Design an enzyme around this catalytic site. Structure first.
Site, PDB file in Angstrom:
ATOM      1  N   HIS A  66       0.847  -1.222   0.000  1.00 19.25           N
ATOM      2  CA  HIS A  66       0.000   0.000   0.000  1.00 19.25           C
ATOM      3  C   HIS A  66       0.873   1.260   0.000  1.00 19.25           C
ATOM      4  O   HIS A  66       0.310   2.366  -0.226  1.00 19.25           O
ATOM      5  CB  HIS A  66      -0.923  -0.075   1.201  1.00 19.25           C
ATOM      6  CG  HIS A  66      -0.238   0.039   2.517  1.00 19.25           C
ATOM      7  ND1 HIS A  66       0.121  -1.062   3.312  1.00 19.25           N
ATOM      8  CD2 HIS A  66       0.117   1.129   3.226  1.00 19.25           C
ATOM      9  CE1 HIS A  66       0.706  -0.636   4.407  1.00 19.25           C
ATOM     10  NE2 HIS A  66       0.697   0.686   4.396  1.00 19.25           N
ATOM     11  N   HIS A  90       8.139   2.025   3.139  1.00 23.32           N
ATOM     12  CA  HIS A  90       8.621   2.485   4.438  1.00 23.32           C
ATOM     13  C   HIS A  90      10.151   2.553   4.424  1.00 23.32           C
ATOM     14  O   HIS A  90      10.803   1.637   3.850  1.00 23.32           O
ATOM     15  CB  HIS A  90       8.176   1.505   5.525  1.00 23.32           C
ATOM     16  CG  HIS A  90       6.699   1.427   5.750  1.00 23.32           C
ATOM     17  ND1 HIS A  90       6.127   0.419   6.534  1.00 23.32           N
ATOM     18  CD2 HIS A  90       5.700   2.256   5.396  1.00 23.32           C
ATOM     19  CE1 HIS A  90       4.810   0.605   6.574  1.00 23.32           C
ATOM     20  NE2 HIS A  90       4.521   1.770   5.935  1.00 23.32           N
ATOM     21  N   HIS A 114       7.700   7.601   6.132  1.00 26.12           N
ATOM     22  CA  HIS A 114       6.992   7.157   4.908  1.00 26.12           C
ATOM     23  C   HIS A 114       6.179   8.328   4.381  1.00 26.12           C
ATOM     24  O   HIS A 114       6.185   9.419   5.055  1.00 26.12           O
ATOM     25  CB  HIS A 114       6.095   5.938   5.183  1.00 26.12           C
ATOM     26  CG  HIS A 114       5.029   6.232   6.175  1.00 26.12           C
ATOM     27  ND1 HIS A 114       5.153   5.842   7.513  1.00 26.12           N
ATOM     28  CD2 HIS A 114       3.810   6.812   6.036  1.00 26.12           C
ATOM     29  CE1 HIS A 114       4.050   6.222   8.161  1.00 26.12           C
ATOM     30  NE2 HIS A 114       3.250   6.870   7.295  1.00 26.12           N
ATOM     31  N   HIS A 121       2.401   9.669   2.232  1.00 27.96           N
ATOM     32  CA  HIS A 121       1.086   9.424   1.630  1.00 27.96           C
ATOM     33  C   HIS A 121       0.951  10.347   0.433  1.00 27.96           C
ATOM     34  O   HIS A 121       1.505  11.457   0.459  1.00 27.96           O
ATOM     35  CB  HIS A 121      -0.074   9.616   2.599  1.00 27.96           C
ATOM     36  CG  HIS A 121       0.019   8.789   3.834  1.00 27.96           C
ATOM     37  ND1 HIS A 121      -0.760   7.661   4.003  1.00 27.96           N
ATOM     38  CD2 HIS A 121       0.778   8.905   4.942  1.00 27.96           C
ATOM     39  CE1 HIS A 121      -0.494   7.130   5.194  1.00 27.96           C
ATOM     40  NE2 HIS A 121       0.451   7.840   5.758  1.00 27.96           N
ATOM     41  N   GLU A 141      -2.966  13.787   3.989  1.00 26.28           N
ATOM     42  CA  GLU A 141      -3.945  13.213   4.934  1.00 26.28           C
ATOM     43  C   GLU A 141      -4.549  14.370   5.744  1.00 26.28           C
ATOM     44  O   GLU A 141      -5.805  14.573   5.689  1.00 26.28           O
ATOM     45  CB  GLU A 141      -3.265  12.136   5.785  1.00 26.28           C
ATOM     46  CG  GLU A 141      -2.843  10.952   4.936  1.00 26.28           C
ATOM     47  CD  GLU A 141      -2.876   9.631   5.671  1.00 26.28           C
ATOM     48  OE1 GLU A 141      -3.606   8.787   5.244  1.00 26.28           O
ATOM     49  OE2 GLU A 141      -2.104   9.532   6.656  1.00 26.28           O
ATOM     50  N   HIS A 179       5.385  11.467   6.918  1.00 27.04           N
ATOM     51  CA  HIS A 179       5.175  11.013   8.327  1.00 27.04           C
ATOM     52  C   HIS A 179       6.536  10.535   8.855  1.00 27.04           C
ATOM     53  O   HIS A 179       7.087   9.609   8.266  1.00 27.04           O
ATOM     54  CB  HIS A 179       4.086   9.956   8.406  1.00 27.04           C
ATOM     55  CG  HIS A 179       2.713  10.487   8.190  1.00 27.04           C
ATOM     56  ND1 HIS A 179       1.611   9.685   7.888  1.00 27.04           N
ATOM     57  CD2 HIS A 179       2.307  11.796   8.195  1.00 27.04           C
ATOM     58  CE1 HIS A 179       0.561  10.497   7.790  1.00 27.04           C
ATOM     59  NE2 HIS A 179       0.946  11.777   7.982  1.00 27.04           N
ATOM     60  N   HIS A 232      -4.035   4.367   9.203  1.00 29.79           N
ATOM     61  CA  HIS A 232      -4.440   3.126   8.518  1.00 29.79           C
ATOM     62  C   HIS A 232      -4.527   2.011   9.563  1.00 29.79           C
ATOM     63  O   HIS A 232      -4.086   2.203  10.685  1.00 29.79           O
ATOM     64  CB  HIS A 232      -3.568   2.839   7.301  1.00 29.79           C
ATOM     65  CG  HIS A 232      -2.169   2.474   7.599  1.00 29.79           C
ATOM     66  ND1 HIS A 232      -1.069   3.132   7.057  1.00 29.79           N
ATOM     67  CD2 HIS A 232      -1.687   1.390   8.250  1.00 29.79           C
ATOM     68  CE1 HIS A 232       0.048   2.500   7.452  1.00 29.79           C
ATOM     69  NE2 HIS A 232      -0.301   1.449   8.188  1.00 29.79           N
TER      70      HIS A 232
HETATM   71  C1  WZH Z   1      -3.874  -7.668  11.019  1.00 30.87           C
HETATM   72  C2  WZH Z   1      -3.006  -6.456  11.271  1.00 30.87           C
HETATM   73  C3  WZH Z   1      -1.898  -6.539  12.109  1.00 30.87           C
HETATM   74  C4  WZH Z   1      -0.967  -5.512  12.179  1.00 30.87           C
HETATM   75  C5  WZH Z   1      -1.117  -4.356  11.409  1.00 30.87           C
HETATM   76  C6  WZH Z   1      -0.078  -3.294  11.409  1.00 30.87           C
HETATM   77  N1  WZH Z   1       0.394  -2.904  12.606  1.00 30.87           N
HETATM   78  C7  WZH Z   1       1.221  -1.854  12.642  1.00 30.87           C
HETATM   79  S1  WZH Z   1       1.703  -1.268  14.231  1.00 30.87           S
HETATM   80  C8  WZH Z   1       3.292  -0.344  13.908  1.00 30.87           C
HETATM   81  C9  WZH Z   1       3.073   1.146  13.684  1.00 30.87           C
HETATM   82  O1  WZH Z   1       3.252   1.963  14.583  1.00 30.87           O
HETATM   83  N2  WZH Z   1       2.594   1.478  12.459  1.00 30.87           N
HETATM   84  C10 WZH Z   1       2.274   2.794  11.974  1.00 30.87           C
HETATM   85  C11 WZH Z   1       2.713   3.976  12.566  1.00 30.87           C
HETATM   86  C12 WZH Z   1       2.277   5.208  12.087  1.00 30.87           C
HETATM   87  C13 WZH Z   1       1.397   5.252  11.011  1.00 30.87           C
HETATM   88  S2  WZH Z   1       0.828   6.839  10.451  1.00 30.87           S
HETATM   89  N3  WZH Z   1       0.381   6.722   8.966  1.00 30.87           N
HETATM   90  O2  WZH Z   1       1.947   7.716  10.536  1.00 30.87           O
HETATM   91  O3  WZH Z   1      -0.344   7.174  11.256  1.00 30.87           O
HETATM   92  C14 WZH Z   1       0.951   4.086  10.412  1.00 30.87           C
HETATM   93  C15 WZH Z   1       1.394   2.859  10.896  1.00 30.87           C
HETATM   94  N4  WZH Z   1       1.664  -1.146  11.588  1.00 30.87           N
HETATM   95  C16 WZH Z   1       1.223  -1.559  10.391  1.00 30.87           C
HETATM   96  O4  WZH Z   1       1.738  -0.983   9.327  1.00 30.87           O
HETATM   97  C17 WZH Z   1       0.339  -2.637  10.241  1.00 30.87           C
HETATM   98  C18 WZH Z   1      -0.079  -3.040   8.925  1.00 30.87           C
HETATM   99  N5  WZH Z   1      -0.391  -3.412   7.882  1.00 30.87           N
HETATM  100  C19 WZH Z   1      -2.241  -4.269  10.571  1.00 30.87           C
HETATM  101  C20 WZH Z   1      -3.164  -5.295  10.510  1.00 30.87           C
HETATM  102 ZN    ZN Z   2       1.432   7.739   7.616  1.00 31.33          ZN
END
Ligand code: WZH
Ligand code: ZN
Length: 257
Positions: free
Chosen positions: A61, A64, A91, A93, A103, A116, A197
């Site tokens: 998607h 990173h 990363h 968007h 976003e 981000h 997300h």
């Molecule tokens: C079933 C399941 C299990 C785990 C995950 C998953 N877990 C995580 S937890 C680690 C984390 O801190 N991710 C994160 C941090 C910041 C942002 S943002 N865009 O800046 O708000 C986005 C993501 N991260 C995924 O990418 C994912 C993913 N993909 C999702 C689904």
């Molecule tokens: Zn992000």
């Protein structure tokens, strides 16, 4: 599998992730007439070590850039924080055209992309996994990216993408300080929010820079030419990965300025 398509996209996330309809969801529209200047906010301090840069990864998607997060070589301090936060990833968007792609929005204005820079609370918690379950566990710096002049600071990142064209590809990405991507002013908005997300955990203190950085139309095209498919399959460009803005539900956005 969650995504950004009509069937698996933001409008459907609530079915497996009901926190999608929560009280601290991100991103938001920042209305400047409703922000509250907070005199206790200290300046943002970033000190990142370029030796902590590790790897770039195509996650289907998005992509990173991950950092070694075993110690405090690369930290965020100040702003609304008492605690030091440890850099782990940055990363972007983007949207299907220049017209949208950020976003966060500011007074309803949509920028072309958003950077981000994500950190976890290493004062209180001992891993990203532990920190991601905590209201105070994550801190993300958001920088709005306004279409215009090519940004040369993006060059190492864009040059790396040809080695991770398809889903699951990864490559070393070393000797990079992402504070070089931040705007010259670190004046900010802050509010309590969420991952943008799945799994959409309400664990993020947001730091949104008031100053934008630039990106060219052709630099955005490079993001959109990444492929969400695995190697050998029909090419499916990564056209967009931005979530719509979510209701404030009584939260206060604070201004450092
Ligand atoms: C079933 C399941 C299990 C785990 C995950 C998953 N877990 C995580 S937890 C680690 C984390 O801190 N991710 C994160 C941090 C910041 C942002 S943002 N865009 O800046 O708000 C986005 C993501 N991260 C995924 O990418 C994912 C993913 N993909 C999702 C689904
Ligand atoms: Zn992000």
């Amino acid at each position: 599998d969650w995504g950004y398509d009509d069937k698996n996209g933001p409008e459907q996330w609530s079915k497996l992730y009901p926190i999608a309809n929560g009280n601290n969801q991100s991103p938001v529209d920042i209305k400047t007439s409703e922000t509250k200047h907070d005199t206790s906010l200290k300046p943002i301090s970033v000190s990142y070590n370029p030796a902590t840069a590790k790897e770039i990864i195509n996650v289907g998607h998005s992509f990173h850039v991950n950092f070694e997060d075993n110690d405090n070589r690369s930290v965020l301090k100040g702003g609304p924080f008492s605690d030091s936060y440890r850099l782990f990833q940055f990363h972007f968007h983007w949207g299907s055209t220049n017209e949208h792609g950020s976003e966060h929005t500011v007074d309803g204005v949509k920028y072309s992309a958003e950077l981000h820079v994500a950190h976890w609370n290493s004062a209180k918690y001992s891993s990203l996994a532990e920190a991601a379950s905590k209201a105070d566990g994550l801190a993300v710096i958001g920088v709005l990216m306004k279409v215009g002049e090519a940004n040369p600071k993006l060059q190492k990142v864009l040059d790396a993408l040809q080695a991770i064209k398809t889903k699951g590809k990864r490559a070393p990405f070393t000797n990079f300080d992402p504070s070089t991507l931040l705007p010259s002013s670190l004046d900010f908005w802050t509010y309590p929010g969420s991952l943008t997300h799945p799994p959409l955990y309400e664990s993020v203190t947001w730091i949104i820079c008031k100053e934008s950085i630039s990106v060219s139309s052709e630099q955005l095209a490079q993001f959109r030419s990444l492929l969400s498919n695995v190697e050998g399959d029909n090419a499916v460009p990564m056209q967009h990965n931005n979530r719509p803005t979510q209701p404030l539900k009584g939260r206060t956005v604070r201004a450092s300025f």
